[PDB]
Amino acid sequence: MISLIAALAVDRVIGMENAMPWNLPADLAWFKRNTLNKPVIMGRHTWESIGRPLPGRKNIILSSQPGTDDRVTWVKSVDEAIAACGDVPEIMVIGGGRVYEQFLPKAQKLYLTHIDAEVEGDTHFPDYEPDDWESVFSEFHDADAQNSHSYCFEILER
Ligand SMILES: NC(=O)c1ccc[n+]([C@@H]2O[C@H](COP(=O)([O-])OP(=O)(O)OC[C@H]3O[C@@H](n4cnc5c(N)ncnc54)[C@H](OP(=O)(O)O)[C@@H]3O)[C@@H](O)[C@H]2O)c1
Ligand SMILES: COc1cc(Cc2cnc(N)nc2N)cc(OC)c1OC
């Protein structure tokens, strides 16, 4: 079972200058509670953006050139990245945009964070067909001190 997990502000924007333009601690905490204790696959750009291994998670990184970090696994094809993860209930594609474009067909589950926000961005979440996806869960939170914008977690299922 392969899952994508992301945070999309309006017009499906996911990043700007190899960052996420928002800082929502409750999103980074959602992301953790779900990804924790399971393989995470990511692109090199995103590995740099994060720029540290995520504890708990076996970190697996997609790049066509040799690895520059010994404490994470490095891989060159989609299948190599899957095999890396092992025999597990659930895999977690944690980004970025070019990775999501490739891992959606094999995906059976989405974890979106819908963000009530208008940001400029260079990177977009793919265009998922709201037919082939069934919303199995939703949860809206208001803007608070730390969480500058309102947001809503959604899980979908193929
Ligand atoms: N919550 C969110 O919305 C979220 C989560 C993650 C990412 N982001 C944002 O998304 C953006 C990432 O943009 P991006 O799409 O350029 O990042 P990316 O997906 O991290 O970068 C993909 C890179 O991974 C490698 N790669 C991917 N598939 C490969 C394959 N099949 N074979 C070989 N190498 C492969 C390539 O690196 P090589 O050049 O080394 O070959 C490729 O350039 C950033 O702005 C980031 O902040 C935000
Ligand atoms: C733990 O920190 C990061 C996590 C992520 C991945 C990620 C984070 N949140 C959500 N909802 N989906 C994701 N795929 C992406 C990041 O930068 C692009 C991070 O650095 C702040």
Author numbering: 1 to 158
What does the paper say about this structure?
Two plasmid-encoded dihydrofolate reductase (DHFR) isoforms, DfrA1 and DfrA5, that give rise to high levels of resistance in Gram-negative bacteria were structurally and biochemically characterized to reveal the mechanism of TMP resistance and to support phylogenic groupings for drug development against antibiotic resistant pathogens.
Furthermore, the antifolate adopts a nearly identical conformation when overlaid with chromosomal DHFRs from other prokaryotic species, including Gram-negative (Coxiella burnetii)57 and Gram-positive (Staphylococcus aureus)46 organisms. Accordingly, when we titrated TMP with a preincubated binary complex of EcDHFR:NADPH, a highly cooperative binding event with an apparent KD of 11 pM was detected (>2000-fold difference). The additional methylene unit in the side chain of glutamic acid results in a 1.4 Å reorientation of the carboxylate head group, subsequently pulling TMP further into the active site by 1.1 Å.
